[PDB]
Amino acid sequence: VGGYTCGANTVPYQVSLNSGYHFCGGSLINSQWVVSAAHCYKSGIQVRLGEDNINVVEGNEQFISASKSIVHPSYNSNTLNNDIMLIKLKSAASLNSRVASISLPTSCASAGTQCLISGWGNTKSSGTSYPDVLKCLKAPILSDSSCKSAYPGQITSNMFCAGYLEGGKDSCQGDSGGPVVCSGKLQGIVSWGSGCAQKNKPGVYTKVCNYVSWIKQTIASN
Hints:
It is a single chain. By secondary structure, the protein is mainly β. It folds into two domains: 1-11 and 102-209, Thrombin, subunit H; 12-101 and 210-222, Beta Barrel (Thrombin, subunit H), CATH 2.40.10.10. The protein has two helices and 13 strands. A seven-stranded antiparallel beta sheet has the order 1-9-8-11-12-13-10. The longest helix has 9 residues, at 212-220.
Protein backbone atom coordinates (compact mmCIF):
# COMPACT_ATOMS: atom_id res chain seq x y z
CA VAL A 1 0.00 0.00 0.00
CA GLY A 2 2.55 2.26 1.31
CA GLY A 3 1.37 4.64 4.07
CA TYR A 4 -0.69 4.96 7.11
CA THR A 5 -3.70 6.43 8.64
CA CYS A 6 -2.88 10.21 9.23
CA GLY A 7 -5.15 11.02 12.18
CA ALA A 8 -8.10 13.38 11.75
CA ASN A 9 -7.19 16.91 10.87
CA THR A 10 -3.39 16.38 11.15
CA VAL A 11 -3.06 17.64 7.53
CA PRO A 12 -5.23 20.78 7.90
CA TYR A 13 -4.69 22.11 4.35
CA GLN A 14 -6.01 18.87 2.74
CA VAL A 15 -9.28 19.31 0.80
CA SER A 16 -11.69 16.90 -0.82
CA LEU A 17 -13.30 17.85 -4.16
CA ASN A 18 -16.78 16.42 -4.21
CA SER A 19 -19.26 16.32 -7.14
CA GLY A 20 -21.79 13.94 -5.54
CA TYR A 21 -18.80 11.83 -4.32
CA HIS A 22 -15.06 12.43 -3.58
CA PHE A 23 -13.10 12.37 -6.95
CA CYS A 24 -9.91 14.47 -6.27
CA GLY A 25 -7.95 16.12 -3.47
CA GLY A 26 -6.37 19.51 -3.43
CA SER A 27 -4.62 21.98 -1.11
CA LEU A 28 -6.02 25.14 0.55
CA ILE A 29 -3.70 28.16 -0.41
CA ASN A 30 -5.54 30.88 1.35
CA SER A 31 -9.08 31.39 2.72
CA GLN A 32 -10.59 31.71 -0.88
CA TRP A 33 -8.41 29.51 -3.16
CA VAL A 34 -7.53 25.89 -3.68
CA VAL A 35 -4.93 24.34 -5.96
CA SER A 36 -5.51 20.92 -7.54
CA ALA A 37 -4.51 19.08 -10.75
CA ALA A 38 -6.00 20.18 -14.04
CA HIS A 39 -6.95 16.57 -14.84
CA CYS A 40 -9.38 17.00 -11.87
CA TYR A 41 -11.35 19.81 -13.65
CA LYS A 42 -15.13 19.42 -13.70
CA SER A 43 -18.29 21.56 -13.49
CA GLY A 44 -20.23 21.65 -10.22
CA ILE A 45 -17.42 21.19 -7.78
CA GLN A 46 -17.91 21.48 -4.12
CA VAL A 47 -14.87 21.92 -1.79
CA ARG A 48 -14.92 19.99 1.50
CA LEU A 49 -12.55 21.22 4.11
CA GLY A 50 -11.84 19.78 7.52
CA GLU A 51 -12.58 16.20 6.45
CA ASP A 52 -11.16 12.95 7.78
CA ASN A 53 -13.86 10.33 7.12
CA ILE A 54 -15.48 11.63 3.96
CA ASN A 55 -18.58 9.34 4.57
CA VAL A 56 -19.39 10.61 8.03
CA VAL A 57 -20.01 14.11 9.36
CA GLU A 58 -17.58 14.30 12.28
CA GLY A 59 -18.16 17.91 13.14
CA ASN A 60 -15.26 19.91 11.85
CA GLU A 61 -16.18 20.13 8.15
CA GLN A 62 -16.78 23.18 5.95
CA PHE A 63 -18.64 22.58 2.62
CA ILE A 64 -18.14 25.52 0.29
CA SER A 65 -18.90 25.49 -3.37
CA ALA A 66 -16.42 26.44 -6.03
CA SER A 67 -17.26 29.62 -7.95
CA LYS A 68 -14.46 29.63 -10.62
CA SER A 69 -12.04 27.03 -11.95
CA ILE A 70 -8.91 28.04 -13.85
CA VAL A 71 -7.03 25.25 -15.60
CA HIS A 72 -3.44 26.19 -16.46
CA PRO A 73 -3.46 27.76 -20.02
CA SER A 74 -0.73 25.34 -21.38
CA TYR A 75 -2.20 22.16 -19.73
CA ASN A 76 -1.77 19.16 -22.16
CA SER A 77 -4.09 16.29 -21.13
CA ASN A 78 -2.23 13.72 -23.37
CA THR A 79 1.04 14.17 -21.63
CA LEU A 80 -0.22 15.80 -18.37
CA ASN A 81 2.20 18.58 -18.85
CA ASN A 82 1.30 21.56 -16.67
CA ASP A 83 -1.20 19.51 -14.62
CA ILE A 84 -2.40 22.24 -12.25
CA MET A 85 -5.64 24.13 -11.69
CA LEU A 86 -6.90 26.82 -9.38
CA ILE A 87 -10.29 26.79 -7.66
CA LYS A 88 -11.86 29.87 -6.19
CA LEU A 89 -14.35 29.50 -3.36
CA LYS A 90 -17.72 31.18 -3.42
CA SER A 91 -17.22 32.26 0.23
CA ALA A 92 -14.02 32.45 2.28
CA ALA A 93 -13.17 29.55 4.61
CA SER A 94 -12.96 30.03 8.45
CA LEU A 95 -9.48 29.17 9.16
CA ASN A 96 -8.84 27.48 12.49
CA SER A 97 -6.61 24.54 13.92
CA ARG A 98 -8.06 22.00 11.64
CA VAL A 99 -8.49 24.07 8.47
CA ALA A 100 -5.32 25.78 7.49
CA SER A 101 -3.60 27.24 4.39
CA ILE A 102 -0.33 25.76 3.13
CA SER A 103 2.46 27.98 1.96
CA LEU A 104 3.87 28.21 -1.50
CA PRO A 105 7.58 27.55 -2.09
CA THR A 106 10.00 30.40 -2.54
CA SER A 107 12.47 27.86 -4.15
CA CYS A 108 12.34 24.22 -5.53
CA ALA A 109 13.11 21.23 -3.29
CA SER A 110 16.33 19.15 -3.78
CA ALA A 111 16.34 15.44 -4.50
CA GLY A 112 16.52 13.42 -1.36
CA THR A 113 14.19 15.82 0.47
CA GLN A 114 11.52 14.39 2.42
CA CYS A 115 7.83 14.92 1.71
CA LEU A 116 4.34 14.13 2.88
CA ILE A 117 1.84 12.93 0.43
CA SER A 118 -1.72 12.86 1.44
CA GLY A 119 -5.02 11.55 0.13
CA TRP A 120 -7.98 9.36 0.47
CA GLY A 121 -8.37 6.07 -0.90
CA ASN A 122 -5.32 4.64 -2.82
CA THR A 123 -7.80 2.06 -4.29
CA LYS A 124 -7.47 -0.69 -1.93
CA SER A 125 -9.71 -0.31 1.18
CA SER A 126 -8.22 -2.64 4.14
CA GLY A 127 -4.60 -1.75 5.09
CA THR A 128 -5.01 0.22 8.31
CA SER A 129 -8.09 2.36 8.00
CA TYR A 130 -10.74 3.53 5.17
CA PRO A 131 -10.59 4.53 1.46
CA ASP A 132 -12.82 6.85 3.80
CA VAL A 133 -10.16 8.21 6.37
CA LEU A 134 -7.24 10.32 5.14
CA LYS A 135 -3.96 8.36 4.41
CA CYS A 136 -0.44 9.58 4.49
CA LEU A 137 2.93 8.51 3.01
CA LYS A 138 6.40 10.00 3.56
CA ALA A 139 8.55 9.78 0.54
CA PRO A 140 11.87 11.21 -0.76
CA ILE A 141 12.02 13.32 -3.86
CA LEU A 142 13.87 11.26 -6.45
CA SER A 143 16.62 12.24 -8.72
CA ASP A 144 15.61 13.64 -12.05
CA SER A 145 17.89 10.79 -13.44
CA SER A 146 15.86 8.03 -11.77
CA CYS A 147 12.50 9.72 -12.67
CA LYS A 148 13.34 9.86 -16.32
CA SER A 149 14.88 6.39 -16.53
CA ALA A 150 11.57 5.12 -15.04
CA TYR A 151 9.54 7.05 -17.79
CA PRO A 152 11.96 7.61 -20.83
CA GLY A 153 10.49 10.29 -23.25
CA GLN A 154 7.65 11.35 -20.84
CA ILE A 155 9.09 13.51 -18.07
CA THR A 156 9.28 17.28 -18.44
CA SER A 157 10.84 20.16 -16.56
CA ASN A 158 7.37 20.54 -14.80
CA MET A 159 7.33 17.07 -13.17
CA PHE A 160 9.26 15.33 -10.45
CA CYS A 161 9.10 11.72 -9.03
CA ALA A 162 8.81 10.68 -5.46
CA GLY A 163 8.31 7.44 -3.80
CA TYR A 164 10.43 4.41 -3.38
CA LEU A 165 11.11 2.89 -6.42
CA GLU A 166 11.41 -0.86 -5.70
CA GLY A 167 7.89 -2.08 -4.84
CA GLY A 168 8.17 0.30 -1.86
CA LYS A 169 5.37 2.54 -0.66
CA ASP A 170 3.19 4.52 -3.43
CA SER A 171 -0.39 5.86 -3.82
CA CYS A 172 -2.82 4.37 -6.67
CA GLN A 173 -5.41 6.66 -8.55
CA GLY A 174 -7.81 8.06 -5.75
CA ASP A 175 -5.42 10.82 -4.53
CA SER A 176 -5.21 12.80 -7.82
CA GLY A 177 -4.87 16.55 -7.19
CA GLY A 178 -3.63 16.11 -3.58
CA PRO A 179 -0.63 17.83 -2.04
CA VAL A 180 3.02 16.87 -1.68
CA VAL A 181 4.43 18.95 1.10
CA CYS A 182 8.03 19.27 2.06
CA SER A 183 9.75 21.53 4.56
CA GLY A 184 6.29 23.12 5.21
CA LYS A 185 5.90 24.26 1.54
CA LEU A 186 3.57 22.81 -1.13
CA GLN A 187 6.13 21.35 -3.60
CA GLY A 188 3.89 19.08 -5.70
CA ILE A 189 0.53 17.87 -6.83
CA VAL A 190 -0.40 14.20 -7.34
CA SER A 191 -0.57 13.87 -11.16
CA TRP A 192 0.02 10.35 -12.63
CA GLY A 193 2.21 7.20 -12.35
CA SER A 194 2.07 3.41 -13.23
CA GLY A 195 1.02 0.91 -10.62
CA CYS A 196 0.62 0.54 -6.79
CA ALA A 197 1.84 -2.76 -4.98
CA GLN A 198 3.76 -2.85 -8.32
CA LYS A 199 7.36 -2.54 -8.81
CA ASN A 200 9.86 0.46 -9.67
CA LYS A 201 7.39 3.05 -11.22
CA PRO A 202 7.46 6.09 -8.93
CA GLY A 203 4.61 8.56 -8.66
CA VAL A 204 4.78 11.62 -10.85
CA TYR A 205 3.96 15.04 -9.37
CA THR A 206 3.44 18.55 -10.80
CA LYS A 207 6.38 20.72 -9.85
CA VAL A 208 4.57 23.61 -8.03
CA CYS A 209 7.77 25.67 -7.71
CA ASN A 210 7.55 26.37 -11.52
CA TYR A 211 4.11 27.89 -11.28
CA VAL A 212 4.33 30.23 -8.27
CA SER A 213 4.34 33.48 -10.31
CA TRP A 214 1.30 32.24 -12.42
CA ILE A 215 -0.51 31.22 -9.16
CA LYS A 216 0.04 34.57 -7.43
CA GLN A 217 -0.83 36.69 -10.61
CA THR A 218 -3.90 34.56 -11.39
CA ILE A 219 -5.25 34.59 -7.81
CA ALA A 220 -4.67 38.40 -7.39
CA SER A 221 -6.68 39.08 -10.66
CA ASN A 222 -9.58 36.83 -9.98
